[PDB]
């Protein structure tokens, strides 16, 4: 993650006896301004780092990560500066949930930057309450019963995301088969609208699998774009205006390489 106000992240292999090896991007010597590389690690004096829901995020919206505490009975965090200043422990009258299943953990639709958690799916809508890392009570609502129900976790050759193929910035619900794709209009508090399909994609469905699939916007609009892997290629489908998808681009893998279930794709601004 980026902690050091970096705008781009340090690598940091880090565990329970964790190394804190903050291997981070430094300018390459010579060459243009754009030249960069990852230098030495730096381990640091740091938190209990274990059995805590211990995790990366700034949750309060502080511009500072808020390394999470949620263990058995114990709840709070520690805040970390760009200076590496791990603040003293933070009990705050936090009101974290049961996390009953971490499945379907909501985040975005509460509001940009103040993300909050709601386990949810068909016929019902649990409610957020996060303000700046504090909470009111949560609630129950539902969107109207005619609206189609987005639903989570069924691995039957398909994918789900909270993701804004529409590039509004609202990471709309989408459901993605090998044949059909569907996105719910953001209705924020307690609701979505009836979903719209998008068009411009298919795969040989008997040959398909969930994943082998990647989701970053690449056209820079905000309309999340799509990649599939292939025995020697990637297929890249680009979102027509937030509505449909262009003919997929065929990218040969590096020579002799083929991608497979060991292999991990990613996108980051090198």
């Amino acid at each position: 993650i980026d902690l050091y106000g970096e705008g781009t992240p340090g690598i940091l292999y880090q565990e329970t006896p964790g190394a804190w090896w903050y291997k981070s991007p430094q300018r390459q010597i010579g060459g243009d301004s754009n030249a960069v590389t990852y230098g030495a690690m730096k381990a640091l004096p740091k938190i209990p780092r274990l059995q805590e829901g211990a995790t990366l995020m700034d949750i309060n919206g502080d511009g500072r990560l808020d390394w999470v505490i949620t263990s058995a009975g114990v709840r709070g965090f520690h805040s970390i500066h760009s200076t590496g200043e791990w603040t003293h422990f933070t009990p705050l009258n936090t009101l974290p949930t049961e996390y009953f299943h971490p499945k379907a953990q909501l985040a975005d639709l509460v509001g940009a930057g103040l993300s909050d958690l709601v386990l949810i799916g068909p016929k019902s809508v649990r409610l957020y309450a996060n303000q700046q890392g504090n909470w009111a009570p949560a609630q129950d609502v539902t969107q109207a019963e005619n609206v189609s129900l987005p639903v989570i976790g069924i691995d039957s050759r398909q994918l789900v995301a909270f993701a804004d193929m529409l590039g509004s910035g609202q990471q709309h619900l989408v459901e993605i088969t090998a044949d059909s794709v569907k996105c719910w209009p953001n209705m924020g508090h307690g609701r979505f609208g009836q979903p719209l399909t998008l068009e411009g994609f298919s795969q040989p469905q008997t040959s398909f699998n969930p994943d082998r699939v990647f989701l970053a916007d690449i056209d820079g609009s905000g309309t999340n774009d799509i990649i599939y892997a292939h025995s020697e290629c990637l297929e890249i489908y680009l979102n027509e205006s937030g509505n449909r998808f262009s003919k997929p681009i065929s990218l040969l893998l590096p020579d002799g390489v083929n991608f497979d279930n060991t292999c991990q794709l990613q996108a980051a601004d090198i």
């Binding site: 040959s207 025995s231 083929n258 497979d260």
Partner: peptide, 28 residues
């Protein structure tokens, strides 16, 4: 060794090298 896979018309054309995980013991 002798090694095999059964043809069940699967995506065999996709494959690539295997990995072994071998375990053994020894007297000092």
């Amino acid at each position: 060794w002798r090694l095999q896979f059964t043809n069940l018309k699967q995506n065999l054309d996709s494959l690539n090298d295997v990995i072994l995980h071998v375990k053994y013991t020894a007297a000092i």
